[PDB]
């Protein structure tokens, strides 16, 4: 009744003006859906709200009933802040404004985020090693440490002009392991398991190391990154090794957890070993021990297996003791020569190993059999330097595709000309053929020419359309059919070593792979004799000789590649921009922290919450 | 008198820590950057210094020699004829406890070939180090070796991966080496308890002199001089005498006239001046000569490395606008 509107009274007054209707509704409730007054008023009010097109409000009500939750856990704020690359500045501007306008602290202050960072970065969680690692500190609260690992910087000491930052490999593994705790537990439950099981778990980890390239703005600054990827986690349950986790996209840049960043050249051997060898020490030390780590309030035990496979060819040779030129031993998996592999194309066993390269290097140094340089070079099969990183004898699918394509490119050059007609080495005319080729690729395709070929160019180049388009500069009509068959066989082959699982994804291509390989080889021997006689490229060799053996051994080749976007550079750049321009040291420190957060499965859950 | 010298084909292989050795007129280069390539598997080179230009030609090894890795700060010396090398820093940052012996085994027209023989040791075997000093002594018939330490990595019990590359001057023991027999024995000096490195060693007859270098546990570059003596049935004694330099290189312009060219004076001050050692029989004193005509580049530099040919001339290196990593000089007296 006038003059007091219902929404301004006391709840006594309200309940009294209303009670007339309350008895009506309470009666109604007890009849249809007794005796939940709450549910009835809910349905009513909601209808009344959507009736008047007040949807934002109705949604907020529906949300409130279900327990959410208007603000945001610091963890989610940090997730947002990273995956959108906000500076601390930017974020703070947004925080304070949303706070001010809404009165609610929907985003969290920066110190909150700072904490979420501490929880998610190496050095937070407690763990212990059994037996404790040789030459590694058992001190558990270690996060970021200096890449130089204490290297002498006296003036008369060997010049160190490089900056580097890293994690302790064990600490980093703990962090990575805790980050994906929920993934492990859910894996267990999905395999029908008490998720309390202590283990032991076997964690298969893929190592990889790459040259970032140039990371500057207008002197160039070269950078190098050692990183790992949790590829598989299995558990001992009776007699079988039950798989409780497998990285869905092993080649994504999202699970490539960064271990060490440095400002060096991957060609600069002394400093490279200076920086990486402490990591390797820790790695080895871990090879012979078990990790104890509490998860669901209950301790679990972990064993690791380190398959170092994500390496460029030049770098595999670097770290495994081989001379890195086309001379004369061309394969990092077998003892073949450029000529032997040019004549027997497809029959080669895998025979190299890190262990063997170690033995061989010792033999070359000591020369136990008193031999001449060539006799010795032959006994030791190319291994004249001491390996310092244990790698798996495999193929990086990325650098494989890149290199193969980089060969097809020079093929295209040598086929728009007539090399099987003219044996004349005129370097200038070579540059002319590259000229008209680069020209024509721009016109018929969407191909911007670039030096130092990457994987994108390689993607755009190895298609049948590019064959048709490169055919337009060729006078002969016979070679068109040869190149078409070459390309077709190559593309019949590529999916087998490019796939992360060809036993599932392309089981047809897998079985026919031997035969396709055969036809390819025959086609190289005859129709392309002019280049591939006495000579052959490393990757052609590897492709023909070693793919089926590697697949038999490991299930795939693709899954063990380097990240297929090579965005190490790109990322380093964005992360750099995300902070104040400080002393180059702190700059590095921050890029490492943010790169680490960037690859946390925990935050990624949040950022991918919108379609789960 | 010194002059700018240019290198050509494979300059890149030159690096701080390289060593030079002298054979009957010809100069040879050891300790390249990186492991030896196919273009020269030995890592040892003909050092062709012709008319202010350096060509680095390859060298071959004997059919029975060891193929020693490029050691980076080895203790090197001679023998009356052969060279002694021990030990150093491989290009994998490992420290060699091994002694390699450099003989020459064949001579031809333009080029020659070497013998390279590792002698292993029982002891009292010295700890794998670098920047240290090794020399030869002639007692009451006939010869022995004297090793005074430099620095090395941590003990294999106290070494942590977080401080993996942390070095420290090893014990100032004096190490006596019997080569031909193949054994070593250490001696503690009451007169010596402070470890040194990157110093300068000069010996003759049965006496060995050691000059100012650089300590670590104190960060001090002494100027003190040290004596060492030897007998024969073996024993050793020491005394002290009245410069402060680090990583100095000593040449021989004349007989018993050693020209000690620069190095470093303070942690950021390169000595830039010179000195002359008053040598004699049981009577030696540090004196000073003039100061050479350093160019503008050498003047405003922070880094000094080089080594001696033997004939008073010396080989010098300087860093370095995207043009060249190094610029080199030759210094004659
Ligand atoms: Zn092979």
XYZ file of C-alpha atoms in Angstrom, chain A residues 21-268:
248
model
C 0.848 -14.701 -1.293
C 3.359 -16.860 0.612
C 0.602 -19.126 1.901
C -0.712 -19.429 -1.667
C 2.678 -20.339 -3.099
C 3.693 -22.608 -0.216
C 0.446 -24.470 -0.758
C 1.183 -24.732 -4.493
C 4.684 -26.022 -3.744
C 3.455 -28.859 -1.557
C 1.158 -30.031 -4.366
C 3.366 -30.051 -7.480
C 6.991 -30.108 -6.331
C 6.848 -30.277 -2.527
C 7.980 -28.687 -0.494
C 10.853 -26.658 -1.918
C 9.651 -23.049 -1.721
C 13.142 -22.099 -2.878
C 12.861 -23.980 -6.187
C 9.450 -22.446 -6.883
C 10.508 -18.870 -6.213
C 13.591 -19.593 -8.280
C 11.637 -20.769 -11.300
C 9.158 -17.904 -10.969
C 11.723 -15.137 -10.617
C 13.868 -16.542 -13.409
C 10.887 -16.618 -15.744
C 10.047 -13.073 -14.714
C 13.614 -12.071 -15.508
C 13.914 -13.651 -18.917
C 10.439 -12.341 -19.636
C 11.681 -8.797 -19.474
C 14.758 -9.618 -21.548
C 16.975 -9.224 -18.498
C 19.210 -12.063 -19.569
C 22.555 -10.906 -18.106
C 20.855 -10.838 -14.726
C 19.191 -14.244 -15.109
C 22.526 -15.727 -16.164
C 24.179 -14.212 -13.136
C 21.532 -15.743 -10.912
C 21.842 -19.196 -12.512
C 25.594 -18.929 -12.053
C 25.261 -17.892 -8.390
C 23.115 -20.899 -7.582
C 25.728 -23.241 -9.090
C 28.457 -22.006 -6.744
C 30.408 -19.649 -9.037
C 32.102 -17.461 -8.190
C 32.399 -13.917 -9.561
C 36.036 -13.197 -8.810
C 39.013 -15.183 -10.065
C 41.575 -17.363 -8.398
C 45.023 -15.767 -8.736
C 45.988 -18.834 -10.821
C 43.333 -17.983 -13.461
C 44.368 -14.342 -13.548
C 47.981 -15.409 -14.115
C 46.828 -17.796 -16.807
C 45.037 -14.962 -18.621
C 47.978 -12.612 -18.108
C 50.401 -15.015 -19.685
C 48.440 -16.496 -22.621
C 47.570 -12.959 -23.817
C 51.064 -11.624 -23.087
C 50.144 -8.703 -20.850
C 52.863 -6.624 -19.350
C 52.619 -6.191 -15.592
C 51.683 -2.603 -16.467
C 48.823 -3.488 -18.830
C 47.410 -6.079 -16.453
C 47.524 -3.716 -13.521
C 45.726 -1.008 -15.484
C 42.972 -3.521 -16.220
C 42.829 -4.820 -12.640
C 42.414 -1.449 -11.061
C 39.853 -0.292 -13.603
C 37.582 -3.345 -13.321
C 37.868 -3.069 -9.551
C 36.962 0.625 -9.569
C 34.044 0.377 -11.967
C 32.457 -2.756 -10.467
C 33.356 -2.390 -6.813
C 34.327 -6.031 -7.001
C 37.861 -7.332 -7.125
C 37.199 -9.557 -10.142
C 40.861 -9.654 -11.100
C 43.535 -10.144 -8.457
C 46.385 -7.831 -7.452
C 49.840 -8.521 -8.827
C 51.293 -9.977 -5.619
C 48.598 -12.636 -5.813
C 49.796 -13.527 -9.295
C 53.369 -13.406 -8.000
C 52.471 -16.195 -5.599
C 50.808 -18.308 -8.275
C 54.078 -17.878 -10.138
C 56.021 -19.165 -7.143
C 53.835 -22.262 -6.892
C 54.214 -22.997 -10.588
C 57.967 -22.478 -11.001
C 60.825 -24.879 -10.124
C 61.814 -24.644 -6.483
C 58.457 -24.563 -4.760
C 57.607 -28.202 -3.986
C 59.498 -30.547 -1.632
C 60.948 -33.809 -3.030
C 63.856 -36.196 -2.429
C 66.133 -38.532 -4.404
C 66.902 -42.158 -3.541
C 69.848 -42.537 -3.713
C 70.544 -38.791 -3.626
C 72.124 -37.598 -6.874
C 75.903 -37.484 -7.276
C 77.271 -33.915 -7.423
C 73.758 -32.459 -7.265
C 72.624 -30.434 -4.260
C 69.943 -32.133 -2.235
C 68.748 -28.662 -1.328
C 65.160 -28.587 -2.506
C 64.354 -24.863 -2.686
C 66.369 -24.056 -5.789
C 64.702 -22.319 -8.712
C 66.553 -20.304 -11.321
C 70.349 -20.533 -11.392
C 73.068 -18.896 -13.518
C 73.874 -20.648 -16.794
C 77.601 -20.076 -16.326
C 77.380 -22.443 -13.323
C 80.155 -20.524 -11.587
C 82.467 -20.200 -14.586
C 85.682 -18.275 -13.992
C 85.452 -14.680 -15.258
C 88.930 -13.393 -14.364
C 90.471 -11.199 -17.033
C 93.147 -13.731 -17.925
C 90.545 -16.515 -17.846
C 89.078 -17.706 -21.139
C 86.844 -14.853 -22.442
C 83.182 -15.378 -21.516
C 81.056 -12.905 -23.480
C 77.793 -14.779 -23.035
C 74.771 -14.688 -20.681
C 72.712 -17.728 -19.767
C 70.105 -18.856 -17.250
C 68.768 -22.321 -16.420
C 66.848 -24.508 -14.013
C 68.213 -27.436 -12.071
C 67.170 -30.363 -14.232
C 65.802 -32.319 -11.281
C 63.944 -29.258 -9.890
C 62.553 -28.524 -13.330
C 61.350 -32.109 -13.621
C 59.647 -31.895 -10.236
C 57.942 -28.682 -11.259
C 56.859 -30.150 -14.595
C 55.585 -33.231 -12.834
C 53.565 -31.368 -10.234
C 52.160 -29.091 -12.919
C 50.488 -32.078 -14.565
C 49.409 -33.840 -11.374
C 45.750 -33.743 -12.317
C 46.535 -35.218 -15.710
C 48.321 -38.147 -14.112
C 45.582 -38.819 -11.584
C 42.868 -38.605 -14.242
C 44.891 -40.896 -16.445
C 44.927 -43.413 -13.640
C 41.183 -43.174 -13.027
C 40.530 -43.506 -16.760
C 42.560 -46.711 -16.737
C 40.381 -47.910 -13.846
C 42.892 -47.471 -10.991
C 42.927 -46.464 -7.311
C 44.496 -43.036 -7.915
C 46.315 -43.499 -4.595
C 48.824 -45.948 -6.098
C 52.375 -44.809 -5.223
C 53.982 -46.348 -8.290
C 56.650 -46.527 -9.403
C 55.876 -44.422 -12.468
C 58.159 -44.393 -15.461
C 58.324 -41.024 -17.111
C 59.617 -40.934 -20.654
C 61.117 -37.521 -21.448
C 62.132 -36.124 -24.828
C 65.149 -33.854 -24.881
C 65.800 -31.308 -27.632
C 68.184 -28.454 -28.287
C 68.045 -25.742 -30.935
C 69.534 -22.532 -32.261
C 67.065 -19.689 -31.767
C 68.849 -17.461 -34.225
C 68.927 -13.704 -33.958
C 67.188 -11.977 -31.083
C 67.875 -8.227 -31.360
C 66.570 -4.823 -32.576
C 68.103 -2.089 -34.756
C 74.992 -6.061 -33.777
C 73.130 -9.410 -33.809
C 72.682 -11.611 -30.709
C 72.508 -15.366 -31.189
C 70.616 -17.545 -28.691
C 70.492 -21.282 -27.890
C 67.873 -23.266 -25.939
C 67.976 -26.684 -24.231
C 64.519 -27.978 -23.328
C 62.539 -31.178 -22.564
C 59.095 -32.700 -23.047
C 57.213 -35.130 -20.832
C 56.189 -37.643 -23.504
C 54.789 -40.556 -21.559
C 53.992 -41.690 -18.035
C 53.374 -45.337 -17.332
C 52.904 -47.308 -14.147
C 53.935 -50.745 -12.919
C 50.712 -52.559 -12.094
C 51.342 -56.227 -11.608
C 52.837 -57.432 -14.853
C 51.970 -54.779 -17.441
C 53.091 -51.181 -17.927
C 49.779 -49.315 -17.816
C 49.901 -45.972 -19.630
C 48.472 -43.183 -17.412
C 49.634 -40.300 -19.572
C 50.620 -39.580 -23.134
C 51.174 -36.068 -24.513
C 48.477 -35.611 -27.187
C 50.599 -33.164 -29.166
C 54.309 -33.884 -28.488
C 55.410 -31.458 -31.183
C 53.431 -28.507 -29.919
C 55.344 -25.575 -28.502
C 53.003 -25.812 -25.533
C 54.572 -28.858 -23.863
C 58.158 -28.089 -24.845
C 59.230 -27.143 -21.277
C 62.353 -24.839 -21.451
C 65.360 -25.789 -19.370
C 68.154 -23.419 -20.297
C 68.468 -20.236 -22.355
C 71.835 -18.845 -23.446
C 73.331 -16.126 -25.642
C 75.823 -18.190 -27.624
C 76.411 -19.649 -31.046
C 75.499 -23.334 -31.473
C 78.770 -23.428 -33.441
C 80.688 -22.066 -30.435
